[PDB]
A paper describes a structure:
The enzyme dUTPase is tightly connected to this pathway, as dUMP is the sole precursor of de novo deoxythymidine triphosphate (dTTP) biosynthesis. These structures all show the well-conserved dUTPase jelly-roll fold; however, there are some structural variations. Here we show that E. coli dUTPase and protein Stl form a strong protein complex associated with nanomolar dissociation constant.
The two resulting mutant constructs (EcDUTQ93H and EcDUTQ93R) were both clearly inhibited by Stl and the inhibition resulted in a decrease of the steady-state velocity by 58% and 47%, respectively. A novelty of our structure is that the whole C-terminal arm of the enzyme is visible in one of the subunits, whereas major parts of the segment are also visible in the other two subunits. We hypothesized that the increased sensitivity of the EcDUTQ93H and EcDUTQ93R mutants for inhibition by protein Stl and their stronger Stl binding ability compared to the wild-type E. coli dUTPase is in connection with the restricted conformational freedom of the C-terminal arm of the enzyme. We therefore conclude that the quenching experiments in the solution state provide re-enforcement for the restricted conformational flexibility of the C-terminus observed in the crystal structure.
Numbering used by the authors:
A (entry chain C): 1 to 137
B (entry chain B): 1 to 152
C (entry chain A): 1 to 136, 141 to 152
């Protein structure tokens, strides 16, 4: 079940020094996002930093959304997760994709340029319309 | 894809003191949930508090569920997120929707009545039927997990 | 709506000492997962431990994934959540299902053999192929719509 998604490269290192995001294995649900940075960033325990990806997507189909998630190795082994926990990307967002990286653990961690620091899945979504009732029975 | 969902305005402040939940933009995936409180609540760093939404929904369709999530601005800038991280709402749950608000950050934060403090999406769900096997049809990923594909 | 998932039992207690995961009601979205431990694990505030389930699943269909989540009661009342926040099980994984348990709260907590410590849903997923373009809410994000 494939879907074409338009993407605009904002930093010319993307697609060259920093490969475009890809699925690590053929049945992976998420694609890995890379940190678009000149220099490594040291995250002390408790600190948050906003990491640019250097690209923008336009999902455009209002029956689809994306969810940014931590990776399980970074999250479990190093406490490197997301500051907003889960990042919900709307179908009508055109801006640069940004990653809120938060050190939830006890050890300092150093994010390298180009590192695969989070992942992103695409999921069908349903828009609800409310039917106001006085009681459900 | 639009679906009509029954909702009971369990707390009549919702729709009167502050607006009913709606989709912030046309192409928004989630709808914002508001703090149904009589008094402001100051959350010190590390603290949690249980905030009512004033709403009960009945999805009723077992092929659908809802998920409650933090908002990205409150979460990234102020460390205001969920105490259970992600809230899962069953299709046959029709009690009040409650929000566990947790201050994961280093500065205190005051939740005001009516404030949009989290968001909710509706997603399709599949119910699994387990088939016991002796061997798997092996794959390239195999048993690999927890960072086996590397950092770079 | 329903999908057949291959499962292998790795610990003989699973299905004998305590049940295999089951949907509690016909309208339940998730299945509860039980800690398959020999000895209870003490978790100080801020600690993380990796908890086996005694089970391996193989979803096998690349338009489907599973998401592991905290339970709302354990999360809100005791701060017992997931160390990777949300656990994403891929269609081509067939290792042991493992739960990263993190004590995010201010009080110690002990993970007990057999305790229902997390839950898991299965959701459809779509794999994307990129189309490079020069030009395409607008660009508004991270709070732009306000809170009032
Ligand atoms: O909570 C979890 C998360 C993942 N897993 C396993 C199954 C999943 O398919 C595999 C990899 O998941 P992620 O891709 O989300 N994490 P990461 O990218 O760090 O690992 P990998 O390098 O193997 O892809 O780890 C668990 O058993 N429990
Ligand atoms: O953030 C939440 C999460 C759940 N809920 C409601 C809806 C859901 O259907 C119900 C049960 O969710 P969980 O299974 O996550 N909680 P728990 O397992 O602790 O309680 P139960 O024993 O009733 O399943 O609680 C909320 O109001 N807010
Ligand atoms: O991790 C994220 C989350 C969101 N975003 C962008 C895309 C999304 O469409 C937009 C808004 O997301 P939320 O609605 O979850 N956050 P918030 O409600 O604070 O911002 P807004 O007022 O713009 O809706 O922000 C990111 O770039 N990274
Ligand atoms: Mg991975
Ligand atoms: Mg928003
Ligand atoms: Mg439950």
């Amino acid at each position: 079940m494939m879907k074409k998604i338009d993407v605009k490269i904002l930093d010319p290192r993307v697609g060259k020094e920093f490969p475009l995001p890809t699925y690590a294995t053929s049945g992976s649900a998420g694609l890995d996002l890379r940190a678009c940075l000149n220099d490594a960033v040291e995250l002390a325990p408790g600190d948050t930093t906003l990491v640019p990806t250097g690209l923008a997507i336009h999902i455009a189909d209002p029956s689809l959304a994306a969810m940014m998630l931590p990776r399980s190795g970074l999250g479990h082994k190093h406490g490197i997760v997301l500051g907003n926990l889960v990042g919900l990307i709307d179908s009508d967002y055109h801006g640069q994709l940004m990653i809120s990286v938060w050190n939830r653990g006890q050890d300092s961690f150093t994010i390298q340029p180009g590192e695969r620091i989070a992942q992103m899945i695409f999921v069908p979504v349903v828009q609800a319309e409310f039917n106001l009732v006085e009681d459900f029975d």
